[PDB]
Amino acid sequence: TGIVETHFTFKDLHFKMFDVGAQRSERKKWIHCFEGVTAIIFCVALSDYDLVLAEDEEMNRMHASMKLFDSICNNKWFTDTSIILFLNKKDLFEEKIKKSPLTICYPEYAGSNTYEEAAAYIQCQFEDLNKRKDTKEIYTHFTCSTDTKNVQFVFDAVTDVIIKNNLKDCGLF
């Protein structure tokens, strides 16, 4: 159906969560309509890295996620909006890292058998371009899906982006 809006006033602020709505149409047509948003949420699964359901035999889900992230960051409409890094891997990724050598993410792997170095590598590799980093801050959080949906981190991020936009247009930075 259409886009689903979830309005919840938790953390003393009227949060509104807007989904993609499964448009399955031209990207820009619904990208430019959402202009004026304060912050966006970027969700990528980490424990399902072995899944190759994105393409039959051409690419994997990692390539699609990286391409979509690059398109979002390089887009001229959202060059100033901050971005949020979320995931849904609390312990499944850690359990899978025991058997998976973490070599599919990068062919030139130079890490151990754990996943801390893999997380560091992916989080430092996400920001391929640094021009938008100065204009818009990038927030990254790991071990998501807490009790109250990680209310503390999202509240801190939203208040930080709000104050940043407030001081940007008043000639204070």
Partner: protein, 336 residues
């Protein structure tokens, strides 16, 4: 099969070659002579205030003396030029609305948005305001445009590349057509309810009949998506609104391309195209605040006007050329 596609596309090449051969004389005739035009063609009317949102599209499809526009804050706008005020301000359930329409009788107002819901509002009511709007669905793609010539049949588009014809009384999917590769962006109401036009990539100005239903008119040559389309005041003509800033007149009977006024003076695309009267003044929006109006008959720019500090999105012209309505995201509505 492969053989069927091959024979079909040799047939298409033969057909387009024949059309070019037959229309070369017409192209030479139209390009040989031009008519004189004015210098500015401008007369200011007023300024509109009382808005704090963005706008996408409007619809000047009524013989009365009012204007209608839609905003993303959730409220519709029905303004008068002289009064610079609104008769009523009804709210909109949808968060975003991109479709705006009005009735010649001033009784029904059509709006819709990303929720795949086409809502018809009651402009005239006993209480003076509409209590609620009826819900219509049946699509998997985002709503793009909707038009109607009466209170019996309504045409609408979707992001799933299909044109839906519905009836107010029935309230169900009455007519549905198979779609092309690209998504339909806009539809133009026919002067006498003959056919409606859909525009997308590789399907520039594809005409579909309302009664018979089959496709007869299809043109190719505009790779970029076409944003806005409108019928000529004289009738039996098309409009080109490709995102590649390509502006070229088209004919229904000719089924062939015409002269193009592309130039290096601009580097961005266009968002809307509109005729003043029989192509006397081509009005087209651009990605910048600055705007220009061309003269198709004179093959030159009629004038330059911006009236905004941000990219303009909506543009409408009265059928009799009484007034033109335009607007950008700066919540400014100016009649040029």
């Amino acid at each position: 099969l492969d053989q069927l596609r091959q024979e079909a596309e040799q047939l298409k090449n033969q057909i387009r070659d024949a059309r070019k051969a037959c229309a070369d004389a017409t192209l030479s005739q139209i390009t040989n002579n031009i008519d004189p035009v004015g210098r500015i063609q401008m007369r200011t009317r007023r300024t509109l205030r009382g808005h704090l949102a963005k706008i996408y599209a409007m619809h000047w499809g009524t013989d009365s003396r009012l204007l209608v526009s839609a905003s993303q804050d959730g409220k519709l706008i029905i303004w008068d030029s002289y009064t610079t005020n609104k008769v009523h301000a009804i709210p909109l359930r949808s968060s975003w609305v991109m479709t705006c329409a009005y009735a010649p009788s001033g009784n029904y107002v059509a709006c819709g948005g990303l929720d795949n819901i086409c809502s018809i509002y009651n402009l005239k009511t006993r209480e003076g305001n509409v209590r609620v709007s009826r819900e219509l669905a049946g699509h998997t793609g985002y709503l793009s445009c909707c038009r109607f010539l009466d209170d019996n049949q309504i045409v609408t588009s979707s992001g799933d590349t299909t044109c839906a014809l519905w009836d107010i009384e029935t309230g169900q999917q009455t007519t549905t057509f198979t779609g092309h590769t690209g998504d339909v962006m806009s539809l133009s109401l026919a002067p006498d309810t003959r056919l409606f036009v859909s525009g997308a990539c590789d399907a520039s100005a594809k005409l579909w009949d309302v009664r018979e239903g089959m496709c007869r008119q299809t043109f190719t040559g505009h790779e970029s998506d076409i944003n806005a389309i409108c019928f000529f005041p004289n009738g039996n003509a098309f409009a080109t609104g490709s995102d590649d800033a390509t502006c070229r007149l088209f004919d229904l009977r000719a089924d062939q391309e015409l002269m193009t006024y592309s130039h290096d003076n601009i580097i961005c695309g266009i968002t809307s195209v509109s005729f003043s009267k029989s192509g006397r003044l081509l009005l087209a929006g651009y990605d910048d605040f600055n705007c220009n109006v061309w003269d198709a008959l004179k093959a030159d720019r009629a004038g330059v006007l911006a009236g905004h500090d941000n990219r303009v999105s909506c543009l409408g012209v009265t059928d009799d050329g009484m007034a033109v309505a335009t607007g950008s995201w700066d919540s400014f509505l100016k009649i040029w």
